[PDB]
Amino acid sequence: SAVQQKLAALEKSSGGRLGVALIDTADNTQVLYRGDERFPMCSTSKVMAAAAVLKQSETQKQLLNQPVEIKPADLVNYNPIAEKHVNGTMTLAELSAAALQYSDNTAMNKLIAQLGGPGGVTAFARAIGDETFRLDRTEPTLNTAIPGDPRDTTTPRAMAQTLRQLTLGHALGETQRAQLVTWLKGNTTGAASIRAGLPTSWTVGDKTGSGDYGTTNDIAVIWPQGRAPLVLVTYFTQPQQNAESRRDVLASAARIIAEG
Ligand SMILES: *C(=O)N1C[C@H](NOS(=O)(=O)O)CC[C@H]1C(N)=O
Secondary structure, three states, X not given: OHHHHHHHHHHHHHOOEEEEEEEEOOOOEEEEXXXXXXXXXXXXXXXXXXXXXXXXXXXXXXXXXXXXEEOHHHOOOOOOOHHHHOOEEEEHHHHHHHHHHOOOHHHHHHHHHHOOOHHHHHHHHHHOOOOOOOOXXXXXXXXXXXXXXXXXXXXXXXXXXXXXXXXXXXXXXXXXXXXXXXXXXXXXXXXXXXXXXXXXXXXXXXEEEEEOOOEEEEEEEEEOOOOOOEEEEEEEEOOOOOOOOOHHHHHHHHHHHHOO
16 A cells, blocks of 8 residues: 555654554544554553543542642652642642643653552553553653563554544543543644644644654544544654654654545
8 A cells, every 4th residue: 555655665764663553433444554563652651541540530520639749759750740739739630631731750650659550550451452552660761662672562553442442432431531532632742743744724632752762652633624533643763772752753654644
């Protein structure tokens, strides 16, 4: 297929390893490139942690309003929102929003804590039928993105399927799903990734991530106007530990998928 040849060429031009999964919910068709290879998730894993807490809130109806202390000891490498509330509290809703929309790593660690450790996040993946996702570590070490290391990885195919179920499907209750969709649509970190390769008019909710080995990721739900939505996962990683991020590769992959 032409899309396959163009993604392969993009990959060749980039010097890295590119993973793409597209699901067209119009006809449930899929486009995959290295769809079954493992990639480090880095911050894209936060969608699963947030969704897991939302699933808890279906029975614990006030859970999202639960205050959680932010202490100095809780701060890690990237805490844009949590640092604003040190020695105070944030609710689990606020932590979820911070994790998703600003990619706050302290917020992610509080979500993991709420779920009883990385094993609790992974259990939620298994619960909704994702047998591929694995979260092994907490922030910041889950972003080491070491080649061949299976920790904290998933595949593009798996992540696309799961993101579909969480946002467009019914893995979550209706109020929860709507909340997740709202958070994703309000992401502030994605302008140069998938979004940059799509028609400006299209509505996108996404979660970015990056890590060592120039790992550069984005997962997205896309709502074209007058057309069934799409799920697009783009993972990218490189052979040098100190490689720079390549968000342009993700934008380019999205463009190739969109029809450009
Ligand atoms: C997620 O991959 N991380 C936390 C934060 N994410 O910002 S990003 O999604 O815009 O890339 C910074 C990078 C990364 C990390 N190494 O902690």
